[PDB]
Amino acid sequence: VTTFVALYDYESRTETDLSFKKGERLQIVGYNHGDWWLAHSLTTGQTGYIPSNYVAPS
Incomplete structure (x- = not known):
């Protein structure tokens, strides 16, 4: 799967x-x-909304 990585x-x-x-x-x-x-x-399997500026592509 394509993934993003959390910056913070x-x-x-x-x-x-x-x-x-x-x-x-x-x-x-x-x-x-x-x-x-x-x-x-x-990591946790949960789904929900996140700030788009808190992640970066792999």
Whole structure:
């Protein structure tokens, strides 16, 4: 699968967003030209919204 890598730690602050740690691998399951992407964490298996500027491509 194509993956992005987290640049920073992020603590979930909404009912729909996803917590993740720096360096973790995320599979983006919904791209959007905006501040939020829908991501699937390969570390935890959870799915939710993340800040698009918090990840970089592999």
